[PDB]
């Protein structure tokens, strides 16, 4: 999970990522 | 005839935004031992002498998809950004939040306020000074509140549609 991604909402491309 | 205005609570997990919302909306405290399940919530009241229709969604289970929460993502005209008083890592976590918000609306200028909840507490970690500073930083007003007491709930709502209004035509 990333820090950047808070809350997870489906089109923020920063969220469909997975470290 | 009557307004909507659809806001959105964001926060880490235990700040009390069910507490806020419910609190808000049904007019009690609620303190549960079980997580929050993400809702939404429809308030009629009168602001400013506009009838106003809010429809709030109190954002929880953060990690997972949601459908409702991406159509208020997309739909949404404001946000509260809450932490809690007594929880520094909380104060620390808006920052991600509020980047999340400017970068899914692609806009500087989202209507939003700071919220530091649980006012009523005896055992505060994070200053007032140190989220108005945030908020100054923001150019968003910084509200204490209490979901326990009521101190500052209506208040902190009343001002993010203030906000809504100041950003568009309503
Ligand atoms: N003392 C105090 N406790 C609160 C306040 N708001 C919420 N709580 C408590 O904080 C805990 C988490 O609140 P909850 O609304 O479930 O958190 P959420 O995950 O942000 O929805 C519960 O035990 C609430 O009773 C408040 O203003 N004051």
């Known amino acids: 999970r990333r820090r950047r991604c808070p809350l997870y909402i489906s089109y923020d491309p920063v969220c469909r990522r997975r470290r | 005839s009557m307004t909507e205005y659809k806001l959105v609570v964001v926060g880490a997990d235990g700040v009390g935004k069910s507490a806020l919302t419910i609190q808000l909306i049904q007019n009690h405290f609620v303190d549960e031992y079980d997580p929050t399940i993400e809702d939404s919530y429809r308030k009629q009241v009168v602001i400013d002498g506009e009838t106003c229709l809010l429809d709030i969604?109190?954002?929880?289970?953060?990690?997972?998809?949601?459908?409702?929460?991406?159509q208020y993502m997309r739909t949404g005209e404001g946000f509260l950004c809450v932490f809690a008083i007594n929880n520094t890592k909380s104060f620390e976590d808006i920052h991600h939040y509020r980047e999340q918000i400017k970068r899914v609306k692609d806009s500087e200028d989202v209507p939003m306020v700071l919220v530091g909840n649980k006012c009523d507490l005896p055992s505060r970690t994070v200053d007032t000074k140190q989220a108005q500073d945030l908020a100054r930083s923001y150019?968003?007003?910084?509200?204490?509140?209490?979901?326990?007491?009521?101190?500052?709930?209506?208040?902190?709502?009343?001002?993010?549609?203030?906000?809504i209004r100041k950003h568009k035509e309503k």
Do not use: C, H, N, W
């Open chain 2, 139 to 163: 150019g968003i007003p910084f509200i204490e509140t209490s979901a326990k007491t009521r101190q500052g709930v209506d208040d902190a709502f009343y001002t993010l549609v203030r906000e």
């Open chain 2, 57 to 70: 969604l109190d954002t929880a289970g953060q990690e997972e998809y949601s459908a409702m929460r991406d």
